[PDB]
């Protein structure tokens, strides 16, 4: 046979993300001495649309603390943030929607977004439109805090990791049908080359393990083991069960 679609994707070429006309990487403000002691004030300048992304981005201007002038940031906007609003970051930031503060100072039961797994990594956990995390409990003896992820799993992170109050803006996007093939075309034209999708049973044996036969059908079981080598891992990988169980 020849190389499969999954094997060809990993080599780049016509399978790279289309990044032209993107505003940049969205991140929390970097951690420094000024906000390790007090608070730093900024102002929201604009709210913009990012190609490929479902959630809006906000441009926030802060004073420069190692010289003269100003510093421009790029945040993921929580719901309810408006142009001209002033926000704070630091150990002494107040509990308002746009503010950034460490999770140790956030009361249990609060909604947070753009949480950082390890201190000083600039956010990585709740970044897609409509998502949020919950602060569950604190442990002052070990200095660790428990959170609940959008998938429902529970994780322990250090109490010095920062987050933003609120939930990500743009919630409800997936409640509307795409309806037409032309809509999915535009959606994926803003992201990467991955659409439309040809079924494996509709191919010839030379280019997929599912192809061939006098009727269209999968010859064997579709569950493959975890240790299958790269050209073999197609179908359901290491599935614990299959079918529509119906219960919890």
């Amino acid at each position: 046979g020849r190389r499969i679609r999954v094997q060809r994707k990993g080599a780049g070429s016509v399978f790279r993300a289309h990044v032209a006309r993107r505003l940049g990487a969205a991140k929390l403000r970097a951690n420094d001495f000024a906000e390790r002691t007090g608070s730093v004030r900024g102002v929201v300048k604009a709210i913009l649309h990012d190609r490929g992304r479902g959630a809006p981005l906000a441009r926030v201007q802060f004073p420069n603390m190692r010289g003269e002038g100003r510093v421009n940031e790029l945040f993921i906007a929580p719901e309810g943030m408006y142009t001209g609003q002033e926000v704070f970051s630091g150990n002494k930031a107040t509990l308002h929607i746009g503010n950034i503060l460490p999770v140790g100072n956030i009361p249990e039961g609060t909604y947070v977004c753009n949480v950082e797994e390890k201190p000083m990594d600039r956010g990585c956990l709740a970044r897609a439109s409509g998502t949020y995390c919950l602060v569950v409990a604190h442990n002052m003896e070990t200095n660790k805090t428990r959170i609940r992820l959008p998938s429902g799993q529970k994780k322990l992170i250090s109490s010095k990791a920062r987050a933003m109050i609120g939930l990500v803006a743009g919630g409800g996007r997936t409640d509307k049908p795409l309806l037409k093939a032309g809509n999915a075309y535009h959606k994926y034209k803003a992201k990467r080359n991955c659409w439309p999708v040809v079924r494996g049973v509709a191919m010839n044996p030379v280019d997929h393990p599912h192809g061939g036969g006098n009727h269209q059908h999968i010859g064997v079981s579709s569950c493959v083991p975890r240790n299958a080598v790269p050209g073999q891992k197609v179908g359901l990988i290491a599935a614990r069960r299959t079918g529509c169980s119906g219960g919890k």
Binding site: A46, I47, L48, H49, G54, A55, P56, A58, A77, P78, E79, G80, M81, Y82, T83, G84, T94, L95, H96, I97, P107, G109, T110, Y111, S129, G130, Y132, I165, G166, L167, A169, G170, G171, G172, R173, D175, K176, P177, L179, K180
Partner: protein, 93 residues
């Protein structure tokens, strides 16, 4: 309702996609084409610009909101919870 009985704005689709999709689109599109009261000046001049971006045609203030509607119920619940938790802390410092 002089021209149609039930399709409403989904009359632009003819007969092409089925009943369930058309009903859901009726609800969502009615919501997303509407005019909303501005939280800063109490006027009904807020319109959608992009998926989660809403602008006021009077004061020119831009806000981050939901897709298809300015406010979402989870957001209201979250804001109320934050406001409650903020007062309890400030009483005892």
């Amino acid at each position: 309702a002089k021209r149609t009985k039930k399709v409403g704005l989904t009359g632009k689709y003819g007969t092409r996609y089925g009943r369930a999709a058309r009903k859901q689109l009726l609800k969502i599109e009615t919501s997303q084409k509407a005019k909303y009261t501005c939280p800063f000046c109490a006027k009904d001049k807020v319109r959608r610009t992009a998926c989660g971006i809403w602008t006021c045609r009077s004061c020119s203030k831009t806000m981050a909101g939901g897709a298809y509607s300015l406010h979402t119920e989870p957001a209201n619940a979250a804001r109320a919870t934050i406001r409650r938790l903020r007062l309890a802390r400030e009483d005892a410092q």
